Amino acid sequence: IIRVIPLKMDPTGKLNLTLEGVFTPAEGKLMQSHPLYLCNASDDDNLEPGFISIVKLESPRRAPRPCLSLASKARMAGERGASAVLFDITEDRAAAEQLQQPLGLTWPVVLIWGNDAEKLMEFVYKNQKAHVRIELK
Amino acid sequence: ACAKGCELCSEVNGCLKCSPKLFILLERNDIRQVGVCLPSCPPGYFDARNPDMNKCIKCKIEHCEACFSHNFCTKCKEGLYLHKGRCYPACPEGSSGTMECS
Amino acid sequence: LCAAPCSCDGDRRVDCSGKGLTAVPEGLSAFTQALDISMNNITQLPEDAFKNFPFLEELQLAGNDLSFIHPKALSGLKELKVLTLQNNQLKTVPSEAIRGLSALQSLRLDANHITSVPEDSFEGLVQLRHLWLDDNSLTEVPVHPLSNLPTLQALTLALNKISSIPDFAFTNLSSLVVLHLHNNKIRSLSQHCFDGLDNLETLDLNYNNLGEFPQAIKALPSLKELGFHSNSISVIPDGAFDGNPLLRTIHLYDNPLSFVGNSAFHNLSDLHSLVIRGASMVQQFPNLTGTVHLESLTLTGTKISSIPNNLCQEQKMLRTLDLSYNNIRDLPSFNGCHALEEISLQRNQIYQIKEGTFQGLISLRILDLSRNLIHEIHSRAFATLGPITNLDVSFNELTSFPTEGLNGLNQLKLVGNFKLKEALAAKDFVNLRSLSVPYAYQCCAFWSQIIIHCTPSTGAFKPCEYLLGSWMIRLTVWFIFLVALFFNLLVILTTFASCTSLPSSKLFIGLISVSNLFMGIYTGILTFLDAVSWGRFAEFGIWWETGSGCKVAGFLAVFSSESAIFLLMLATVERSLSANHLKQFRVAALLAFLGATVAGCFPLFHRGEYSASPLCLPFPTGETPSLGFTVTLVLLNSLAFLLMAVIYTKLYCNNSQSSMIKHVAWLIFTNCIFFCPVAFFSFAPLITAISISPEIMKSVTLIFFPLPACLNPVLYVFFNPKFKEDWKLLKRR
């Protein structure tokens, strides 16, 4: 579960989320991650360590072929100080069943299939962007 | 509809594929990161053609404003001289009113 | 004083991009230096279009769909320095238009659909320094036009339809530094295609159709970076890099490389990267003598027989050393590599580790020895090592494991060594945080750091403290054993002690009583084992599951169950026959005990022995063992129960035989009742969507499985009037 709890004060924002993570526990802050950013040609920013990367996937029907396997996708993310990795399959449940369901890796992989986690992505939009702390579960 | 200058637009993560004659730049804010087609890369970046999709890339040489490629510069800061694509405090072995030096 | 259509910025610069003007705006000051009129729809340039622009120095025409330019349109521009015509529809080279420019220094002509170039082009440009000509439809390199640019320094011709390069194509480019020629149809280069480039520093030839390594690179004494990836090059012979002593980076990935010369990487001093993959036809280690500043070295998918011993003595700057997918026999001493951090030796054929193989290392952090067939490890092999966080030794043939000097470990992997039956001490791995061992019982010792991991995940079926569990099941199993062991013996003594010849009716009761005695013996064995080791069980689980005691008990259990069900069915059939055949029932009963022998003989001789639990019963606890046997067993038992019920019904549908009939009916009903729950729990997770915790299943299996062995004799002792008179003859004895 990715509990919604931000560094800015908010009510009923405890357990402000409840999710699913089929491949360990860890807590840290959430950062967006453009889909095309997870590619070899992309320059690695490496801004600061101790963060969780949230990646949203679009529809694979109108979409052309990805640069790398969702596999190497999560892998590379590992290197990034982003210590955790989530993946959005709302408009792609094939990504839900994608690659070796098992985590050949260890950086906790947590897909969502969230009907309220896309609601939480609208939260990441928010009116104050984020400055939002993050809770695993 | 579709964002201007983009042909595969999305309202969640931004444009996906721009026009075949235009570039896409990954402009990241403090929280989010949105790609934004644009006619030319900003001065700190340089153009990089590719048959599949174009993209702007940062340079790896310091004290350079605009650079031809990752291993070549064409304009440093208002200051130290330039020699064969390298910006140096003094003109090395070049014996050099332009800030050009060669 | 700035026209609206084109509001100005300042600093003698006017910006009017993206206004859609059909002509150059008027009224602008003639003192302006830089003008930006890009992103418009100016298709025609009239004569003297820049009449009122004498001090122009910078001009841009990005995205204007320009078609025709008047020959005299650019006249009067004596101060222009940078002119960019970047995305347009020129479809030609305006050689005559740019003829009047003398102070120009940069020129962009990319993506203009240019297919032809006049021979007299590029004349009068004595101060040009850059030239963009990428993304066009050119078919050949314009050798002749480029001969009039002695001051050129940069040139790019990427993304074109070029297929070959003639000799001396750049003979007059004496100041060229960087040249890009990637993404073309190049397939054959002449030996003198790069003559005259005495100052070349960067050359790019990626994404082409090259099939042979170019030998024309020997005339590039000043080359620094060279890259030729994404091609069809497979041979790199010796001497391929003898004329380029100052190389720094070489890219050769994503190619069908199979053969590399033995001395193809000698005398290179500034090189600091070497990644070669797929070299399936390489037998000798590359001659890296002369290279002292190398930082990384990766050689995978090769047939290297041995590693030279002077690797860490000639030079000490390596940080990583990966030698996966090789055939290295022995590990040379690694003394000397002071800065080495990561070592990878996955999938090799190393025999063992000597006393001082890793002695002297001071910064080793990540180490891996997976799938290497290691036999013995020295006690003090890791004593000299310092702070190490990862140590992966998995899928090997280890028999022991040293533990001294491993306080800083955070990830040990030993999953796969079936011969490691000992127990590892937990007082020397305080900082361990992610472990994986071959057997489940070894995690009991580990289970203020977070809980360590355990790949076997020992639980209800893999007990750590008590074999049976709670305080009730011990009493239950004790009561079941004490009742069965005496009642079955009493029935056997009473039945077969009167006469040798007995009716076939009063026969099967004795055989059923014998089968129940075998089940009670199995329960007594289980409770004796549980009682011997009460406080501690993690120290005896390995000897029990991997020893020679579990299979005997298992053979005894399977034999008892199969014998009970087959004899009950035969008794039902025999009673069905009656409504003279005493010469065959005995043969039928003898053939039946053999049935159970084949039943249990099988789960033993079969490789898939059922030992997922210390109880060693056929009922499934997981998918690891052979599920077919259980399915077969459960399918056969269900078919027998359905046939007996029908025959006896038919019998009930339509003296002293009434008591025997009633006794047989009660026995089959009791046996049928105490078999459904076990069968239901056997395949419940397979079909049903509801999961059940293993503890409840274990308790139900322990209670309901040996219950019929106790229930069978107690009914016979009380109900049957025959037993009420059987002891009368035994009293005389």
The experimental method, as deposited, was cryo-EM
User: Which of chain B's residues have a Cβ under 8 Å away from the Cβ of A132?
Assistant: 31
Nearest Cα residue to C464 out of C429, C430, C439, C428: C439
> Distance between CA C426 and CA C446 in Å, rounded?
6
Cβ atoms of A3 and A137 within 8 Å: the answer is yes
> Distance between CA C77 and CA C53 in Å, rounded?
8
Would you list which residues of chain B are within 8 Å, Cβ to Cβ, of chain A? 8, 10, 12-14, 16-17, 24, 26, 28-35, 55, 57-58
- CB contacts < 8 A, A to B, total 52
Q: Please judge whether B33 and A34 are an interchain contact, meaning their C-beta atoms are less than 8 angstroms apart.
A: yes
Place of tokens 């009068």: C124
Place of tokens 């000799």: C167
Place of tokens 């001659």: C287
Most A CBs within 10 A among B31, B50, B59, hence the mutation to make, goes to B31
DSSP string, C317-355: ---EEE--S----S----TT-SS--EEE--S-----B-T
Chain centre distance of CA C521: 48
> Distance between CA C585 and CA C567 in Å, rounded?
11
Element (H, E) at A29: strand A29-32
According to DSSP, the residues that pair with C668 across neighbouring strands are none
Cβ atoms of B99 and B76 within 8 Å: the answer is yes
What chain C residue is nearest to B22 in terms of C-alpha separation? Answer: C87
At residue C390, the 3 state secondary structure works out as strand
Element (H, E) at A52: strand A51-56
> Distance between CA C733 and CA C726 in Å, rounded?
12
- CB contacts < 8 A, B to C, total 40
DSSP string, C210-276: --S--SGGGG-TT--EEE--SS---EE-TTTTSS-TT--EEE--SS---EE-TTTT-S--S----EE
The answer for C124, left when phi > 0, alpha when psi is -120 to 50, beta otherwise, is left
Cβ atoms of C415 and C455 within 8 Å: the answer is yes
- Residues with Cβ within 8 Å of A89's Cβ and at least 6 positions away in sequence, in order, are A57, A95, A96, A111, A112, A113
Q: Please judge whether C178 and B71 are an interchain contact, meaning their C-beta atoms are less than 8 angstroms apart.
A: yes
User: Which of chain A's residues have a Cβ under 8 Å away from the Cβ of B10?
Assistant: 58
> Distance between CA A70 and CA B28 in Å, rounded?
22
Chain centre distance of CA C631: 32
> Distance between CA B35 and CA B5 in Å, rounded?
12
Q: How far is B34 from chain A (nearest CA, A)?
A: 7
> Distance between CA B71 and CA B61 in Å, rounded?
7
Among C38, C130, C225, the residue with its CB nearest the CB of B71 is C225
Residue-wise burial string across C156-179, b where 16 or more C-beta atoms lie within 10 A, e elsewhere: bbbbbebebbeeebbeebebbbbb
Element (H, E) at C666: helix C657-673
Place of tokens 């729950």: C677
Breaks (C–N over 2.5 Å) after residues, chain C: 447, 579, 654
Nearest Cα residue to C530 out of C459, C456, C441, C470: C470
Q: Please judge whether C62 and B49 are an interchain contact, meaning their C-beta atoms are less than 8 angstroms apart.
A: no
Cβ atoms of A59 and A88 within 8 Å: the answer is no
> Distance between CA C195 and CA C187 in Å, rounded?
19
At residue C511, the 3 state secondary structure works out as helix
| Cβ-based neighbour number of residue C257 at 10 Å | 20
Q: How far is A28 from chain B (nearest CA, A)?
A: 14
> Distance between CA C65 and CA C398 in Å, rounded?
74
Nearest Cα residue to C142 out of C162, C125, C112, C113: C162
User: Which of chain B's residues have a Cβ under 8 Å away from the Cβ of A32?
Assistant: 13, 28, 31-33
Burial of C4 (0-12, 13-18, 19+ CB in 10 A): exposed
B96 and chain C: CB distance < 8 Å anywhere? no
Strands C188-189 and C164-165, by their bridges, are parallel
Q: How far is B76 from chain C (nearest CA, A)?
A: 16
According to DSSP, the residues that pair with C180 across neighbouring strands are C156, C204
> Distance between CA C357 and CA A87 in Å, rounded?
44
Cβ atoms of C87 and B21 within 8 Å: the answer is yes
Nearest Cα residue to C313 out of C328, C296, C333: C333
At residue C204, the 3 state secondary structure works out as strand
Most A CBs within 10 A among B11, B16, B54, hence the mutation to make, goes to B16
Q: Where are the alpha helices (DSSP H) in C455-507?
A: 471-495
> Distance between CA C398 and CA C420 in Å, rounded?
7
Burial of C469 (0-12, 13-18, 19+ CB in 10 A): middle
Breaks (C–N over 2.5 Å) after residues, chain A: 23
Nearest Cα residue to A83 out of A18, A36, A135, A29: A29
Nearest Cα residue to A86 out of A63, A117, A123, A129: A117
Task: Give the end-to-end CA distance of chain A in Å, rounded to a whole number.
Answer: 4
Chain B, 63 to 92: residues with Cβ < 8 Å from chain C are 68-69, 71-72, 74, 84-85
Q: Which two tokens stand for residue C590?
A: 């003898």
C15 and chain B: CB distance < 8 Å anywhere? no
Q: Where are the alpha helices (DSSP H) in C506-626?
A: 508-532, 541-545, 550-577, 585-605
Place of tokens 């989530």: A86
Residue-wise burial string across A123-137, b where 16 or more C-beta atoms lie within 10 A, e elsewhere: bbeeeeebebebbbe
Own/partner long-range contacts of C305-310 (Cβ < 8 Å, ≥24 apart): C305/C329, C306/C330, C306/C332, C307/C331, C307/C332, C308/C332, C309/C333
At residue C309, the 3 state secondary structure works out as coil
Q: Which two tokens stand for residue C57?
A: 């120095």
Cβ atoms of C324 and C345 within 8 Å: the answer is yes
Cβ atoms of C217 and C202 within 8 Å: the answer is no
Cβ atoms of C403 and C428 within 8 Å: the answer is yes
> Distance between CA B50 and CA C204 in Å, rounded?
14
Amino acid sitting at position A126? K
Nearest Cα residue to C633 out of C717, C720, C707, C559: C559
Nearest Cα residue to C492 out of C512, C466, C522, C474: C512
> Distance between CA C517 and CA C486 in Å, rounded?
9
The Cα angle at residue C720 between residues C714 and C726, in degrees rounded to 5: 95
Burial of C74 (0-12, 13-18, 19+ CB in 10 A): buried
Among A58, A129, A132, the residue with its CB nearest the CB of B13 is A58
Amino acid sitting at position C579? A
Q: Is the dihedral of CA C622, C628, C629, C632 positive or negative?
A: positive
- Residues with Cβ within 8 Å of C655's Cβ and at least 6 positions away in sequence, in order, are none
Nearest Cα residue to C265 out of C233, C231, C307, C299: C299
> Distance between CA A12 and CA C102 in Å, rounded?
72
Residue-wise burial string across A57-77, b where 16 or more C-beta atoms lie within 10 A, e elsewhere: bbeeeebeebbeebeebbbbb
> Distance between CA C503 and CA C26 in Å, rounded?
130
* Residue C437 DSSP class: -
> Distance between CA C281 and CA C283 in Å, rounded?
7
Strands C259-260 and C235-236, by their bridges, are parallel
Cβ atoms of C216 and C192 within 8 Å: the answer is yes
> Distance between CA C229 and CA C212 in Å, rounded?
12
| Cβ-based neighbour number of residue C483 at 10 Å | 17
Q: How far is A126 from chain B (nearest CA, A)?
A: 11
> Distance between CA C670 and CA C708 in Å, rounded?
8
- Residues with Cβ within 8 Å of C227's Cβ and at least 6 positions away in sequence, in order, are C203, C204, C205, C206, C249, C250, C251, C252
The answer for A42, left when phi > 0, alpha when psi is -120 to 50, beta otherwise, is beta
Cβ atoms of A109 and A96 within 8 Å: the answer is no
- Three-state SS string over A108-121 comes to CEEECCCCCHHHHH
- Three-state SS string over C494-508 comes to HHCCCCCCCCCCCCH
Cα Rg, chain B, nearest whole Å: 18
Question: Nominal resolution in Å?
Answer: 3.6
> Distance between CA C592 and CA C152 in Å, rounded?
100
Residue-wise burial string across A88-117, b where 16 or more C-beta atoms lie within 10 A, e elsewhere: bbbbbeebbebeeeeeeeebbbbbbbbeeb
Most B CBs within 10 A among C106, C136, C202, hence the mutation to make, goes to C202
User: Which of chain A's residues have a Cβ under 8 Å away from the Cβ of B30?
Assistant: 129-131
> Distance between CA C223 and CA C67 in Å, rounded?
40
- Phi, psi values for residue C639, rounded to 5°: -65, -45
The number of C-alpha atoms within 13 Å of C55 and in the hemisphere containing its C-beta is: 10
Q: How far is C201 from chain B (nearest CA, A)?
A: 9
Cβ atoms of C67 and C54 within 8 Å: the answer is no
Q: Which two tokens stand for residue C530?
A: 């549980």
Cβ atoms of C681 and C697 within 8 Å: the answer is yes
Cβ atoms of C312 and C290 within 8 Å: the answer is no
Cβ atoms of C410 and C434 within 8 Å: the answer is yes
B98 and chain C: CB distance < 8 Å anywhere? no
Among C39, C106, C111, the residue with its CB nearest the CB of B21 is C111
> Distance between CA C454 and CA C447 in Å, rounded?
9
> Distance between CA B45 and CA B58 in Å, rounded?
5
| Torsion, CA B56, CA B61, CA B65, CA B66, rounded to 10 | -50
> Distance between CA C258 and CA C233 in Å, rounded?
9
At residue A123, the 3 state secondary structure works out as helix
Task: Give the end-to-end CA distance of chain C in Å, rounded to a whole number.
Answer: 139
* Residue C377 DSSP class: B
Q: Please judge whether A41 and B34 are an interchain contact, meaning their C-beta atoms are less than 8 angstroms apart.
A: no
The Cα angle at residue A29 between residues A27 and A30, in degrees rounded to 5: 115
Instruction: Give the total residue count for chain A.
Output: 137
Amino acid sitting at position C458? T
At residue A6, the 3 state secondary structure works out as coil
> What Å distances lie between residue C581 and C331, C501, C504, C578, C662, CA to CA?
79, 15, 9, 9, 22
> Distance between CA C715 and CA C512 in Å, rounded?
12
